[PDB]
Design a protein around this motif. Structure first.
Motif, PDB file in Angstrom:
ATOM      1  N   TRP A 192      26.791 -22.955 -29.011  1.00  0.00           N
ATOM      2  CA  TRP A 192      26.361 -24.315 -28.577  1.00  0.00           C
ATOM      3  C   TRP A 192      26.688 -24.549 -27.100  1.00  0.00           C
ATOM      4  O   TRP A 192      27.724 -24.137 -26.617  1.00  0.00           O
ATOM      5  CB  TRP A 192      27.160 -25.277 -29.454  1.00  0.00           C
ATOM      6  CG  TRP A 192      26.226 -26.173 -30.183  1.00  0.00           C
ATOM      7  CD1 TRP A 192      25.626 -25.894 -31.357  1.00  0.00           C
ATOM      8  CD2 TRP A 192      25.780 -27.490 -29.796  1.00  0.00           C
ATOM      9  NE1 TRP A 192      24.832 -26.971 -31.717  1.00  0.00           N
ATOM     10  CE2 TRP A 192      24.896 -27.983 -30.778  1.00  0.00           C
ATOM     11  CE3 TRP A 192      26.065 -28.287 -28.689  1.00  0.00           C
ATOM     12  CZ2 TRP A 192      24.309 -29.243 -30.660  1.00  0.00           C
ATOM     13  CZ3 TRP A 192      25.479 -29.556 -28.558  1.00  0.00           C
ATOM     14  CH2 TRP A 192      24.602 -30.035 -29.544  1.00  0.00           C
ATOM     15  N   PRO A 193      25.782 -25.216 -26.436  1.00  0.00           N
ATOM     16  CA  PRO A 193      25.960 -25.528 -24.996  1.00  0.00           C
ATOM     17  C   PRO A 193      26.980 -26.658 -24.826  1.00  0.00           C
ATOM     18  O   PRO A 193      26.687 -27.812 -25.068  1.00  0.00           O
ATOM     19  CB  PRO A 193      24.573 -25.985 -24.555  1.00  0.00           C
ATOM     20  CG  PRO A 193      23.913 -26.486 -25.801  1.00  0.00           C
ATOM     21  CD  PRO A 193      24.515 -25.734 -26.961  1.00  0.00           C
ATOM     22  N   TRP A 194      28.176 -26.338 -24.414  1.00  0.00           N
ATOM     23  CA  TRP A 194      29.210 -27.400 -24.235  1.00  0.00           C
ATOM     24  C   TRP A 194      30.044 -27.125 -22.985  1.00  0.00           C
ATOM     25  O   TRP A 194      31.246 -27.296 -22.981  1.00  0.00           O
ATOM     26  CB  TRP A 194      30.087 -27.303 -25.476  1.00  0.00           C
ATOM     27  CG  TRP A 194      31.173 -28.319 -25.401  1.00  0.00           C
ATOM     28  CD1 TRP A 194      31.065 -29.575 -24.907  1.00  0.00           C
ATOM     29  CD2 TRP A 194      32.534 -28.163 -25.832  1.00  0.00           C
ATOM     30  NE1 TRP A 194      32.300 -30.196 -25.015  1.00  0.00           N
ATOM     31  CE2 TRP A 194      33.242 -29.356 -25.582  1.00  0.00           C
ATOM     32  CE3 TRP A 194      33.205 -27.094 -26.412  1.00  0.00           C
ATOM     33  CZ2 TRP A 194      34.593 -29.480 -25.905  1.00  0.00           C
ATOM     34  CZ3 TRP A 194      34.564 -27.200 -26.741  1.00  0.00           C
ATOM     35  CH2 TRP A 194      35.261 -28.394 -26.487  1.00  0.00           C
ATOM     36  N   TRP A 195      29.418 -26.701 -21.930  1.00  0.00           N
ATOM     37  CA  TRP A 195      30.166 -26.408 -20.678  1.00  0.00           C
ATOM     38  C   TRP A 195      31.107 -27.566 -20.325  1.00  0.00           C
ATOM     39  O   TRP A 195      30.672 -28.589 -19.835  1.00  0.00           O
ATOM     40  CB  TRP A 195      29.081 -26.263 -19.616  1.00  0.00           C
ATOM     41  CG  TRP A 195      28.776 -24.819 -19.391  1.00  0.00           C
ATOM     42  CD1 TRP A 195      28.245 -24.296 -18.263  1.00  0.00           C
ATOM     43  CD2 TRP A 195      28.978 -23.713 -20.301  1.00  0.00           C
ATOM     44  NE1 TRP A 195      28.111 -22.928 -18.430  1.00  0.00           N
ATOM     45  CE2 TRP A 195      28.551 -22.521 -19.676  1.00  0.00           C
ATOM     46  CE3 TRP A 195      29.488 -23.639 -21.601  1.00  0.00           C
ATOM     47  CZ2 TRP A 195      28.631 -21.289 -20.324  1.00  0.00           C
ATOM     48  CZ3 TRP A 195      29.572 -22.402 -22.263  1.00  0.00           C
ATOM     49  CH2 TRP A 195      29.142 -21.227 -21.625  1.00  0.00           C
ATOM     50  N   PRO A 196      32.377 -27.359 -20.571  1.00  0.00           N
ATOM     51  CA  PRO A 196      33.388 -28.399 -20.256  1.00  0.00           C
ATOM     52  C   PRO A 196      33.623 -28.458 -18.742  1.00  0.00           C
ATOM     53  O   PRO A 196      34.692 -28.134 -18.268  1.00  0.00           O
ATOM     54  CB  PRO A 196      34.643 -27.908 -20.972  1.00  0.00           C
ATOM     55  CG  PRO A 196      34.466 -26.426 -21.093  1.00  0.00           C
ATOM     56  CD  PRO A 196      32.984 -26.156 -21.159  1.00  0.00           C
TER      57      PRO A 196
END
Length: 13
Positions: A6-10
């Motif tokens: 999942w795309p979740w670039w913090p």
């Protein structure tokens, strides 16, 4: 097999 990448670039480290 892979679960679900999942795309979740913090951005804020």
């Amino acid at each position: 097999i892979l679960p679900w990448k999942w795309p979740w670039w913090p951005w804020r480290r």
